[PDB]
Amino acid sequence: GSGMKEFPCWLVEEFVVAEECSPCSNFRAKTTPECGPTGYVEKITCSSSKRNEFKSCRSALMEQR
């Protein structure tokens, strides 16, 4: 309707994967869209204002023997 604008910090700031992405519970994924393609969401912090966002990463490459 109005056109609310909501964005992350990694899109406008430098982020650092501090916490690898992991599976999303029944509510974790149902609420987070990042759990759609990979289903695993990591925790990246932005050096700018130290902001931790919920991103999605590949687990098959992060840790797959």
From Swiss-Prot:
Disulfide bonds: none annotated. It is found in: Membrane; Mitochondrion; Cytoplasm; Cytoplasm, Cytoskeleton, Microtubule organizing center, Centrosome. Induction: Protein levels increase during the S phase of the cell cycle, are highest during G2 and mitosis, and decrease to low levels at G1. Levels are lowest at the transition from G1 to S phase. Residues 8-65 are extracellular. It comes from the Eukaryota. Ubiquitous. Expressed in all normal human tissues studied but overexpressed or underexpressed in many of their malignant counterparts. Required for normal cytokinesis during mitosis. Plays a role in the regulation of cell proliferation. May be a component of the chromosomal passenger complex (CPC), a complex that acts as a key regulator of mitosis. The CPC complex has essential functions at the centromere in ensuring correct chromosome alignment and segregation and is required for chromatin-induced microtubule stabilization and spindle assembly. Increases AURKB activity. Inhibits apoptosis induced by TGFB1. Overexpression induces swelling of mitochondria and reduces mitochondrial membrane potential. Belongs to the JTB family. Interacts with AURKA, AURKB, BIRC5 and INCENP. May be a component of the CPC at least composed of BIRC5/survivin, CDCA8/borealin, INCENP and AURKB/Aurora-B. This is Protein JTB. The chain holds residues 47 to 104 of 146 of the full protein.
